[model samples]
Target: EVPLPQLRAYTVDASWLQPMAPLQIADHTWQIGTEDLTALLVQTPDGAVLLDGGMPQMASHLLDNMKARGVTPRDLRLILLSHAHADHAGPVAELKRRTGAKVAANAESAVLLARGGSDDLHFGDGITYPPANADRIVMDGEVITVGGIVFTAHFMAGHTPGSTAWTWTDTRNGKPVRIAYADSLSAPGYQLQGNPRYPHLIEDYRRSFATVRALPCDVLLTPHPGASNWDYAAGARAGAKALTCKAYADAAEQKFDGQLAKETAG
Candidate 1:
């Protein structure tokens, strides 16, 4: 795991994100955003694939991003959610309606999202947003191919149950690259260690850290890059694996211990 001092040293300069824009990652894959809420926009033969929809207010930004790229909400066929969080999956309802796209997520999240997040507050800081239904319930290790683009959904639960990350191989800049989305490890206080919030909470994060360490991520991205403070997304991809993996594990470890200490002290 990454060392605390080294890990704590990294941070996002909001000024660097003043104008949130779309960045192309591969042949047909682009990164779109608002604040730290970034989503991948992939194009298929028939329509487009949106990895994740930003917050509710960011829907307009997302729609405009597509329009700038010569596509519209109607052109989107799939809206893949990373998890059931306010900033991440909140816009699904509107985007699904506007694009007529089928929202997809892991089986666990499928139920939570479809029911409009009525079951739990989930990873949201406080308020829950509009509930969005996922048309496809992806299973762990399932490979989904749309229009010719193929990607595998990976379960990396910690930030929330059913936190699904994705990995795929594609040609970018005339070279084949393995791109993977490593979901956030945000905690609901002691969720990853003791005082569990859900079933298998501890095991979930342990496996997630191990899983990410094992992935062949030529490109590693998180829903919110700064949240993880990974170097993979902003620098050379060659050596990012070790740095990124350690960073994630280090983060989870720190938060888990810190929260435990706080509870103990109290």
Candidate 2:
């Protein structure tokens, strides 16, 4: 019974907030998000696990889209996060309140979530949002099982201190396919070289790049659909067929190197 409303216009680009129909990415996973941003809903025997809530403005659209696909707010059991950035985690506090779902994230992300986007080391004095705390803190390689579906969380720091990637298996033509929801690797406006506050910035990015590249990924899903070449019109079947974890990791590494070089010179 969730009402579908147009996405609220904010300072972000219009293209990023454009609405899109929910598309099933796997046997049980569906992409219920805006054209550019991503929020995945995984239906299971127990309930549903929502991965990454989109911007605050897109909250109603996300819920309504889930309703369109027969997933109501009551079906939501767990709300997972890759990081606590506004664009990805802004609506979580509201979603948690509405759905009564428990939120889960890595330890660092928990702090970020509680801070609500203030005092960000990378994005200083960034956009503040409704803060929410994580109900559970998962460690690297920890398996979280919900409704018979198993998800392995991988810590991919650097983009944020607690950025994480997730891996799960789904059936395709009676065969199991490995799907990975890799974390954001880009460090927009970050000091990748010599940051006095964050001494491990370079090492963390390097380790994360390696971790993602080595993941067992048959299908790649990123926080942003565009990062994985997800064609909004074509949907997941066409867009996700060619993506791989290694390729995504390599692309991030290349971009990181370029940014690092610039920072070193500056």
- Best model per TM-score: 2
Given candidate 2, what's the lDDT at residue 141?
A: 95
Q: Each candidate's TM vs. the true structure?
A: 0.81, 0.93
TM-score of 1: 0.81
Q: Write the per-residue lDDT of candidate 1 for residues 1-266, one digit (tens) a residue.
A: 76555222213345323335667767788777654666788887778888877566667778888888878777888888777766677778888778768877887788777665555634332436677777777888998887877878889887777788888777866898887777777675443334435667767777887787777677677777665553324534412343455566677667766765776787
Local distance difference test, per candidate?
0.70, 0.85
Backbone clash tally (model 1): 1
State model 1's lDDT: 0.70
**lDDT (Cα) of model 2:** 0.85
Worst 10 residues of 1 by lDDT: 7-16
Q: Tens-digit lDDT track for model 2 on 35-92?
A: 7788998888888899998788778888898788777888889988888888899899
